[PDB]
Design an enzyme around this catalytic site. Structure first.
Site, PDB file in Angstrom:
ATOM      1  CD  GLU A   1     -11.301  -0.497   2.910  1.00  0.00           C
ATOM      2  OE1 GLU A   1     -11.426   1.038   3.290  1.00  0.00           O
ATOM      3  OE2 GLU A   1      -9.938  -1.413   2.200  1.00  0.00           O
TER       4      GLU A   1
ATOM      5  CD  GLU B   1      -2.458   2.126   1.982  1.00  0.00           C
ATOM      6  OE1 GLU B   1      -3.833   2.757   2.459  1.00  0.00           O
ATOM      7  OE2 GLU B   1      -2.906   0.452   2.653  1.00  0.00           O
TER       8      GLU B   1
ATOM      9  CD  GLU C   1      -6.443   3.385   1.163  1.00  0.00           C
ATOM     10  OE1 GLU C   1      -7.838   3.101   1.016  1.00  0.00           O
ATOM     11  OE2 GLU C   1      -5.463   2.631   1.617  1.00  0.00           O
TER      12      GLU C   1
ATOM     13  CG  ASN D   1     -12.201   3.396  11.358  1.00  0.00           C
ATOM     14  OD1 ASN D   1     -13.161   4.649  11.739  1.00  0.00           O
ATOM     15  ND2 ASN D   1     -11.621   3.300  10.921  1.00  0.00           N
TER      16      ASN D   1
END
Lengths: 408, 204
Positions: free
Chosen positions: A330, A209, A254, A397
């Site tokens: 996600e 990432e 990412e 989260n």
């Protein structure tokens, strides 16, 4: 040195690698297990291999052979390898509903019964295929009630123990999840196993990432990183490759979309054709992914980000030329007082065949323990350790608290 | 559109699927094409209406394609996605809600497009029943059309009221509908689904 440290004694002449495979017939009433083994050291004719399948205390099948496979090219074959194929009648299938396991044993032995060494694994019969725009497991279309999980302990940082694993596994099931996405790097070895035995679909991901680059493309497009990158995907594959829980591979996370991604995707496809490859960077629908896996795409509303838009999941499937299945990597950011709308998702998943689920984000709170002026604890976060630069709460989260206590 | 409608048969296909009806249908197709094929307004050839789906439609559509590749063909019968249409062209499919009727359901239009396999454009051959005090939800449609590329719009049902003028005990006229002519069997108001009165005075 956050994971285990070990010592292993191996024979001079040993088992270097081995892979299992299981092809099935139309109805699945019959299968073949394929084991391919390689060896190291000195190769003598008196050398044999024995692969044998076991269901409990019962021997399902057994096969023995000398090294040296088929002719592969003009130069010949591999003499330090052997492949065995064992036929299995009405095999017990592995799924996250009934993780039917067999155990498989490999013996490196000599022609006269003497055993050099043995290695093994739990084998699980199953098929993962994309077919006609749908992801199928064992001939049936999956619905992925999944979650993104991090390797986190409020006390031990990123060190993991069976207890913590196992606790999680259980919550997961009790709560109606089939799958786990290893965000965003290979995980501690046990895990796979557990998933194999408890039953969860697992998405294994390369440790890659590059989020902070500008563009995010920066390195991933650079051939110079192609090697470094390559090691992060390949090795994962040489490691996790025989676990039944693993159903899909991911290129990382990412890191935009670079030529480097594309080769590695093809790499994987050649190497291990039994599982889809997925990667979201670059817009969720690039050539480096077998599945549209956006993150945070809405059900009905479009996010037309220049260059990398986030279409309404529903619209995304009927875009001109598209036919791939959609599974969100996600979705549903579960940060503190959140999860409004979860329903919307579920109804679409339920209404659209090609919308086979997603991974909520995420499992736990990335909260760390801290003690006050009295030895009293309290949950620590972004910048609580005078850490800079920092994103404070953005680390919380989870659906459950770091101690594994449920968020409503 | 070809003059072929056998709606009232059980099944709807009874003829459309009967080799003996081949020749007849054949000529309703062939002659229409041969007469109208030079107008630029025609951009789409249709095989008729609600006649279910029969081996005769496939043949006939094949003919069109062969003789006039300049235009697409379309036909709604048998489920709106048969092999005899170049477009999914249902009537009354709802935007967001499905109607899974046996053999020929009506998926939410947005939903239909992604059905595994599917790649054709979707254009409603009939949608939004202008029947009386109607046209509610209209926008819902206009909005999907606009968000989904493959949703090319559609055709409202319908233009004019198929009402007929009658006169009273004093030669003053009035708008008559089904069975007002002592016609039996009939289907009353069912004949008035327009957007404008039968005199071209518009409805709201």
């Amino acid at each position: 040195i956050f994971r285990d440290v070990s010592l292993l004694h191996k024979p001079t002449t040993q088992i270097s690698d081995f892979h299992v495979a299981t092809r099935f017939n139309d109805d699945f009433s019959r299968a073949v297990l394929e084991a391919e083994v390689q060896m190291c050291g000195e190769l003598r004719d008196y050398l044999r291999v024995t692969v044998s399948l076991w269901q409990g205390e019962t021997q399902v099948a057994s096969g023995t052979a000398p090294f040296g496979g088929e002719i592969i090219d003009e130069r010949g074959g591999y003499a330090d390898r052997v492949t065995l194929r064992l036929n299995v009648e009405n095999p017990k299938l592995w799924s996250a509903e009934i993780p039917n396991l067999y155990r498989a044993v490999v013996e490196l032995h000599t022609a006269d019964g003497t055993l050099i060494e043995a290695e093994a694994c739990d084998v699980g019969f199953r098929e993962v295929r994309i077919e006609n725009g749908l992801l199928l497991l064992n001939g049936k279309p999956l619905l992925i009630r999944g979650v993104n999980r991090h390797e986190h302990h409020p006390l031990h940082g990123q060190v993991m123990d069976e207890q913590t694993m196992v606790q999680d596994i259980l919550l997961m099931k009790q709560n109606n999840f089939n799958a786990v996405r290893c965000s965003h790097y290979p995980n501690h070895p046990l895990w796979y196993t557990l998933c194999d035995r408890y039953g969860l679909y697992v998405v294994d991901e390369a440790n890659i990432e590059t989020h902070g680059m500008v563009p995010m493309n920066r390195l991933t497009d650079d051939p110079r990183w192609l090697p470094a990158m390559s090691e992060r995907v390949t090795r994962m594959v040489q490691r996790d490759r025989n676990h039944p829980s693993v159903i899909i591979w991911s290129l990382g996370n990412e890191s935009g979309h670079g030529a480097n991604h594309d080769a590695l995707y093809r790499w994987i496809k050649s190497v291990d054709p039994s599982r889809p490859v997925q990667y979201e960077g670059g817009g969720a629908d690039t050539t480096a992914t077998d599945i549209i896996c956006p993150m945070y795409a809405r059900v009905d509303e479009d996010q037309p980000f220049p260059a990398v838009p986030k279409w309404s999941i529903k619209k995304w499937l009927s875009l001109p030329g598209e036919t791939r299945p959609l599974i969100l990597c996600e979705y549903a950011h579960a940060m503190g007082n959140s999860l409004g709308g979860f329903a919307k998702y579920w109804q679409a998943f339920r209404q659209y065949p090609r919308l086979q689920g997603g991974f909520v984000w995420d499992w736990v709170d990335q909260s760390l323990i801290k003690y006050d002026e009295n030895g009293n604890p309290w949950s620590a976060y972004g910048g609580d350790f005078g850490d800079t630069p920092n994103d404070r709460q953005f680390c919380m989260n989870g659906l459950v608290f770091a101690d594994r206590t449920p968020h409503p």
